[PDB]
Structure 1
Amino acid sequence: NANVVVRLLIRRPECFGPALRGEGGNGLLAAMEEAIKIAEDPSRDGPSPEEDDTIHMGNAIMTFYSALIDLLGRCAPEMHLIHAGKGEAIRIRSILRSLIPLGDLVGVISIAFQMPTIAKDGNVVEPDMSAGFCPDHKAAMVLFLDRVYGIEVQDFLLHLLEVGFLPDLRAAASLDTAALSATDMALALNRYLCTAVLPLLTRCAPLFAGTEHHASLIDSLLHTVYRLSKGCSLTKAQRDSIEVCLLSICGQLRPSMMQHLLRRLVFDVPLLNEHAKMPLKLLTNHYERCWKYYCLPGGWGNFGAASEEELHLSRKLFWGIFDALSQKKYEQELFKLALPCLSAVAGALPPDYMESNYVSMMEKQSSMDSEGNFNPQPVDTSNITIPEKLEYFINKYAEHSHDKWSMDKLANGWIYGEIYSDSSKVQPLMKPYKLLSEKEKEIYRWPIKESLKTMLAWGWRIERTREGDSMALYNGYSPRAIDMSNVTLSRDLHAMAEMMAENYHNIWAKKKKMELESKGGGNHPLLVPYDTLTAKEKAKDREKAQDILKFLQINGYAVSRGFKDLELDTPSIEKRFAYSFLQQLIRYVDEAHQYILE
């Protein structure tokens, strides 16, 4: 019944719609864009001379094309016959692929929705089902993509995840507040995700093996899915689908990539609530699959070994779960799910493990707070005052930044002059930074001072080498400055720059948060944490941190970690993990003996 329908449809191409007639046809993606514009325009949508009587033409076109795509994808042959090699099925696949290009499907998936927003009254303004782009439209597109084209390449899988799926997941995770949970938008998006997207990513689990390059994207996927798993409006089937998808992806994932998700898990599992059941199984599976990663000194040769920070996290998780289970009243399936996790973590932990005497400081657990799951606050540096020696460095970086801005204006075509006109593209500010005035210099200087006061608040030691002093001892216009594209920092400096990038994003998070609450609506999509942010979103702040650290290095100043350990107590056997574990076990056994004596 599918072959006959496909043959009749290709015999009469009029059934494919004006966009897909094949002559003068803009295409499926262009048809969707035109439908968006039609739905936005009031005159073209309604009759314009009874809500049921009214038909939105844009939504009707959207539904027609979605139905055609769904029908064709369902007519696509089953994979078993294709593997068997039936020439008729191969021909049907070829015809369908010729009819619908892949790029159009990717574009239509990449089209974004319109979230409901809160109002000043506290009421919710809601876009309508009857008019607009709905997730049911993308459902058919995904069905076509995974029924005729198929995702069998890791590069295609990660590109699709980056372009179409991740934004929708982030939107669903951001629509998880108390008021917006019951909105029709959120229910439709949840159904779409849990019925089409997540099962597809579950079936494409093995492709996630060799993804060391897209570590940020995989980490963002893991955080977004886990955050969505905490929603309230989610039904039993949707929750089970999310659990299956997470368990499937994490198993094929490499051990090193799970660190950021474990950071959140060690904070929520101790609660031992109903939601903790899935994290319990996830932790059990991870620590059973990657036991050689921790216990063995070398671990997997290709994978590597722990960084002692994962070991500290695992120790904290183990002890937190142990204490929480000791305090908690007996609950049969909670205990039955938690015991294997405790055993797996205990087995993974090296018995000879040395706990960090230099305990990890300045963790941003407040950023990953319990309520709202994101509290953005930077490390305030107003009390910290700048040193006098770095004034020369500040001046040099300010003039370098002014020069680069002059690069950019010359490239865009702005011309020097004496009159300031934005329309005329004439700019008196093309003069050299030395000829700039103070609060012509101040606009450059202020971010510079703030950034390294932020450095100072963290206690990092900034120093100038004797050769750095040799630099200063040695001591309109055509601007030409240092090209720092080739300069590279060490890994330690890369992590240092990453953490200031996180702080500098947190600053913008605060400013945008008070903008959010001042306007009273329109939640910004990029309000997600730094870990949840992807590479393209992170790029600007990362390169800012990179170039400031690079200029420090080039000018010869030295930046390091200002904290020093007073004494590394390696010989002490008492703080070995086995010591505390056995001592606590002995205390528990003695307590039980006294209880049974009574």
Structure 2
Amino acid sequence: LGQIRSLLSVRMGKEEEKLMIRGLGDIMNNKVFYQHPNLMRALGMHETVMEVMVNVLGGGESKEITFPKMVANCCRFLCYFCRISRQNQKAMFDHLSYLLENSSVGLASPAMRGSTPLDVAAASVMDNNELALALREPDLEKVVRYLAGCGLQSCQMLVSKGYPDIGWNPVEGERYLDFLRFAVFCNGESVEENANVVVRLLIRRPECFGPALRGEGGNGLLAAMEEAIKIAEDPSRDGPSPEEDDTIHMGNAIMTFYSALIDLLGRCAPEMHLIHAGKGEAIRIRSILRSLIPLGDLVGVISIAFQMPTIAKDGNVVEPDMSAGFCPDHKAAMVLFLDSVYGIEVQDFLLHLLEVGFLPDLRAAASLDTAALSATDMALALNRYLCTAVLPLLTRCAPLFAGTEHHASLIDSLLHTVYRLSKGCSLTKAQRDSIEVCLLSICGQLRPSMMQHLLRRLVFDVPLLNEHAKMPLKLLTNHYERCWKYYCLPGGWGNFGAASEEELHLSRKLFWGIFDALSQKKYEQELFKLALPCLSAVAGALPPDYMESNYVSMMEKQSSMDSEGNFNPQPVDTSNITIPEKLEYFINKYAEHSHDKWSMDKLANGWIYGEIYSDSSKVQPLMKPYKLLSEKEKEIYRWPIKESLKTMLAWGWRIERTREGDSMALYNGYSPRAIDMSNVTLSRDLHAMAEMMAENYHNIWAKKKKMELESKGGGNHPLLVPYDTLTAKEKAKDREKAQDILKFLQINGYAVSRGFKDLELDTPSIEKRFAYSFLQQLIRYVDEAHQYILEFDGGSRGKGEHFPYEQEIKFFAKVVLPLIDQYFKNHRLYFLSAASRPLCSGGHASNKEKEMVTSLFCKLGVLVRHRISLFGNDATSIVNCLHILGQTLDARTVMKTGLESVKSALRAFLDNAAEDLEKTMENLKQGQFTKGVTQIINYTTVALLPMLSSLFEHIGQHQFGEDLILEDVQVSCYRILT
């Protein structure tokens, strides 16, 4: 500090500049500068540096600023000094005025970011409410005047350095806008007092908005952005052309200026709470901003697409320079303005904006999930822009997703893209959490029936139980907890509908996969605490009497999805299919129809008639009658129909010959007139046919384009995406020609039907029931748990306190027991149903099902007998499960139609309870004045009393005593009573 103070007294030169730069570096390196800001302010270092700055700036004030390095270093030191502490910031705020006149010292020169007097002024008020409120109208007026000058007059040094002489100064205008943004927006909240003043000054000087938005012939903001993009990709207008250094990239400069202006106005927008309260000034400001910026311009700018990085030959990534083209930060400001001023309050506008501006960006980000391409500047910037601007907007607009039954394809594509982006790597924890919250809120608001594709995608992915499995697990838990009536109740949730048995098979597969994966997985605390609620919710959602279809839908949608890669196009082979000769008439007729329709479309386009066959004179098609067409011309029509019929036969759907239509047609210059055909209807099965076969065609095209891609050596075509993720307009062509072929089949009457039928009705519900399989697995697992507990009783007493089966016992204690409790609590009425009808849906669990309920109850009782201390805190779980099972016990039906081993086990449970009570009798007697006694006493008082209480309450309520308590169990009950 003494060196710098001494250098104050000598005229500035190269040697003194070097000495003072080194001194400032040493000071910013010292500890005390950071540890004791009060000492620094008391020594008045900021004043000394300001005096040096004043001297340097005054030296050659009219000329260019001599020793720009000194100014940059002083600015950096003062910015750091402001950042040190708030009192330092307040002290530097007193020099705000001078810095405002000297703001334009080095704005135009790049590589001085954060090293300008304007930057020092911004740091003097950055994130400080008092200083922002202490800002004055003249202080903002100076900046507004400078910005108006920048918007009106070009940059002298820039044009001297050879740059094209556009009429305005985007480079300096952007920095002035940034300072105004810091002035009006502080600590995440908009200072209304400063925002109103800034808006008023800007509208008083409309030249501050640049050429566009100035009116009086100025084009739109969308047009300005497009022209700036053209400049950016066109050299000789972007650079001078006689580390950016000399390069400024004037297209990016213009784009950044407009983005900064939009961001500043959006931050100046008034708060929605004030708008609702009705502050006339707030409504006035919002109306002014709406008048300046039309909504359509923002929509178009958001719809503008980026330039994706390209993988080229030899595995080289070509990523266009961010500082030279269109950046996601430019669209972030547009989204901010759209949210702040206009807002999204109506479902149709939300869906339109999602389809035109957000879904393409999400799809591009999801496509950039390759290991090499996931670290590029474009990929990271796009991920940041998404997770910081777009996804929170959709999260806040989630309630608008209520009535979205019509735009199912759009939001299915949204869900698929979001899930793929979540699965993608190179994402920060905060970004991943934002993805999770957005997807959770969205899926919660959507309808149960139409997230089936996302359910299908999660089925193949979540059983892996990796780190990323947390989000899909919570998603499934919430969805099945909310929408359980959609599955279990035969009627359904109501107007929503009911499961189509495809969702039921999907959910059963998901449940069994998750159960097996969790059984074989090593115990993890959070993973199990998340998985168990998911398993319970899925079990409750699935109908207890669900019939598992022994045959799956042929080539179900697993071929389209891939392991890890998630997209392997798998078109069905057409080699072994042979086309029947009876379809030749249809092939000929459809070829005629297609040729006539194409001739109509060609004449409607209005193109020169086909009077000869000429290439250059481009008279190719001849529009000649199909009967007059050559055999090789017929090939271009016959071959697509041939492939269509090949797929039709490969998929096992019969086409039979309608006798009426077949006999009907058999007896049944140039006129291109063809058939108005789009008015024909299709059934539900026909529509599903058309959808799946158009999906096959999209897969064929995607695979062909993919081989083209690796033939070129790289790339990623935007539409190379699964058909489910493919959007409506992009599916339109395939779906339309699907409709065309099916409709022509229908009009010829050629009857299409499903063909391959179920091999057997599968009446063994008792054997194929989901509850049957679940209870079999549960009783089996309880059996191994029992055998393990006997192994422990054999080993631990001698030497084996630690036993090798720790993870098995943890699985049984943590997952199996609560699953049993929740399942039987949800479906108590189903198992308890009988010839009587306590439940109205139909229920009526099978006799074998009730038998296994009884057997599971007996097994759990045997397991818990004198082992509460072994389970420790789990003893509450075992007694709760036994309580619920005893409530659900169907004793009368089990004893009427049941197996002798299960009946004997149920009798032995009561016999063991009586024997334990008698043992407690002799322990309490003659032992009240003076060990296994404590074990039997506390085991009884903790577990035995609640079990008998619940069982006897259930038996008395349902009058099962007259049907269950007979003979030996009456003897045991007499002993229990005594």
Band of TM-score, shorter chain: over 0.9
Conserved? CA contact 1:260–1:531, under 8 Å: yes
Q: CA deviation at 1:569?
A: 1.2
Conserved? CA contact 2:220–2:297, under 8 Å: yes
Conserved? CA contact 1:414–1:427, under 8 Å: no
Q: Deviations over 1:176-212 (max 9, x none)?
A: 0010010000000000000000000000000000000
Q: CA deviation at 1:53?
A: 2.1
Distance 1:317 1:523 in 2: 32
Say which SS state the counterpart of residue 19 (structure 1) adopts: coil
Distance 2:352 2:293 in 1: 19
Conserved? CA contact 1:431–1:476, under 8 Å: no
Question: CA separation of 1:474/1:334 partners in 2, compared to 1, >3 Å: closer, same or farther?
Answer: same
Question: CA separation of 1:31/1:423 partners in 2, compared to 1, >3 Å: closer, same or farther?
Answer: farther
Conserved? CA contact 2:599–2:623, under 8 Å: yes
Conserved? CA contact 1:381–1:457, under 8 Å: yes
Q: Deviations over 1:428-484 (max 9, x none)?
A: 521100000000111111101111111001111011111122223223411112111
1:341 pairs, out of 503, 522, 534, with: 534
Q: Deviations over 1:1-57 (max 9, x none)?
A: 000000000000010100111111111000001001101111001101173221000
Question: CA separation of 1:94/1:394 partners in 2, compared to 1, >3 Å: closer, same or farther?
Answer: same
Q: CA deviation at 1:414?
A: 2.6
Conserved? CA contact 1:415–1:427, under 8 Å: no
Say which SS state the counterpart of residue 628 (structure 2) adopts: coil
Q: CA deviation at 1:574?
A: 1.4
Distance 2:664 2:608 in 1: 33
1:210-289 paired onto structure 2 within 5 Å? 210-289=403-482
**More deviation, 120-129/196-205:** 120-129
Q: CA deviation at 1:269?
A: 1.0
Conserved? CA contact 2:239–2:249, under 8 Å: yes
Conserved? CA contact 1:401–1:444, under 8 Å: yes
Q: Deviations over 1:263-316 (max 9, x none)?
A: 011111110111101111000000000011111111221111110110001111
Distance 1:376 1:473 in 2: 41
Q: Deviations over 1:526-565 (max 9, x none)?
A: 0010000000000000011110011011012111112111
**More deviation, 364-373/86-95:** 364-373
Higher relative contact order (CA 8 A, sep 6+): 1
**More deviation, 136-145/424-433:** 424-433
Say which SS state the counterpart of residue 656 (structure 2) adopts: strand
Question: CA separation of 1:101/1:417 partners in 2, compared to 1, >3 Å: closer, same or farther?
Answer: closer
Q: Which has the larger radius of gyration?
A: 2
1:384-423 paired onto structure 2 within 5 Å? 384-421=577-614
Distance 2:275 2:388 in 1: 25
Say which SS state the counterpart of residue 507 (structure 1) adopts: helix
Q: Deviations over 1:484-524 (max 9, x none)?
A: 11001111000001000000011101110011011123311
The aligned counterpart of 2:777 is 584
Tell whether 2:252 aligns with 1:59. yes
2:710 pairs, out of 517, 520, 523, with: 517
The aligned counterpart of 1:15 is 208
Conserved? CA contact 2:459–2:509, under 8 Å: yes
Conserved? CA contact 1:413–1:425, under 8 Å: no
Matched length:
598
Conserved? CA contact 2:222–2:301, under 8 Å: yes
**More deviation, 296-305/187-196:** 296-305
Q: Deviations over 1:545-592 (max 9, x none)?
A: 110011011012111112111211134311111111111111111100
Q: CA deviation at 1:154?
A: 0.2
The aligned counterpart of 2:69 is none
Distance 1:518 1:417 in 2: 37
Distance 1:37 1:415 in 2: 35
Say which SS state the counterpart of residue 751 (structure 2) adopts: strand
Q: CA deviation at 1:231?
A: 1.3
Say which SS state the counterpart of residue 260 (structure 2) adopts: helix
Distance 2:390 2:243 in 1: 36
Distance 2:228 2:295 in 1: 20
Distance 2:431 2:215 in 1: 40
Question: CA separation of 1:50/1:577 partners in 2, compared to 1, >3 Å: closer, same or farther?
Answer: closer
Conserved? CA contact 1:76–1:148, under 8 Å: yes
Conserved? CA contact 1:358–1:568, under 8 Å: no
1:462 pairs, out of 626, 640, 655, with: 655
Conserved? CA contact 1:354–1:570, under 8 Å: no
Q: CA deviation at 1:426?
A: 2.9
Q: Deviations over 1:52-90 (max 9, x none)?
A: 221000000000000000000000001111010100000
Say which SS state the counterpart of residue 124 (structure 1) adopts: strand
Say which SS state the counterpart of residue 426 (structure 1) adopts: coil
Say which SS state the counterpart of residue 547 (structure 2) adopts: coil
Conserved? CA contact 2:222–2:300, under 8 Å: yes
Question: CA separation of 1:567/1:417 partners in 2, compared to 1, >3 Å: closer, same or farther?
Answer: closer
Distance 1:429 1:28 in 2: 48
Distance 1:462 1:266 in 2: 34
Distance 1:109 1:278 in 2: 29
Conserved? CA contact 1:416–1:426, under 8 Å: yes
Question: CA separation of 1:150/1:189 partners in 2, compared to 1, >3 Å: closer, same or farther?
Answer: same
Q: CA deviation at 1:141?
A: 0.0
Q: CA deviation at 1:372?
A: 1.3
The aligned counterpart of 1:429 is 622
Q: CA deviation at 1:366?
A: 2.5
Q: Deviations over 1:116-137 (max 9, x none)?
A: 0111111101100110000000
**More deviation, 466-475/435-444:** 466-475
Distance 1:178 1:326 in 2: 32
Q: CA deviation at 1:415?
A: 3.6
Conserved? CA contact 1:471–1:555, under 8 Å: no
Question: CA separation of 1:422/1:159 partners in 2, compared to 1, >3 Å: closer, same or farther?
Answer: farther
Q: CA deviation at 1:419?
A: 2.9
Distance 2:568 2:458 in 1: 17
Root-mean-square deviation (CA), in Å? 2.2
The aligned counterpart of 1:36 is 229
Conserved? CA contact 2:592–2:626, under 8 Å: yes
Conserved? CA contact 1:394–1:445, under 8 Å: yes
Distance 1:467 1:43 in 2: 73
User: Which one has a larger percent helix, Structure 1 or Structure 2?
Assistant: 2
Q: Deviations over 1:304-358 (max 9, x none)?
A: 1110110001111111111100000101111011000000001111111111133
Conserved? CA contact 2:600–2:674, under 8 Å: no
Distance 1:454 1:223 in 2: 27
Distance 2:636 2:334 in 1: 49
Distance 1:360 1:392 in 2: 31
4+ residue segments displaced more than 6 Å: none
The aligned counterpart of 1:116 is 309
Conserved? CA contact 1:209–1:253, under 8 Å: yes
Conserved? CA contact 2:365–2:382, under 8 Å: yes
Distance 1:442 1:433 in 2: 12
2:493 pairs, out of 292, 295, 300, with: 300
Say which SS state the counterpart of residue 559 (structure 1) adopts: strand
Unaligned runs of 5+ in 1: none
Distance 2:320 2:530 in 1: 42
Conserved? CA contact 1:430–1:476, under 8 Å: no
The aligned counterpart of 1:546 is 739
Identical-residue share of aligned pairs (%): 100
Q: Deviations over 1:363-406 (max 9, x none)?
A: 13122111311000200112211110110110000011010111
Conserved? CA contact 1:376–1:506, under 8 Å: yes
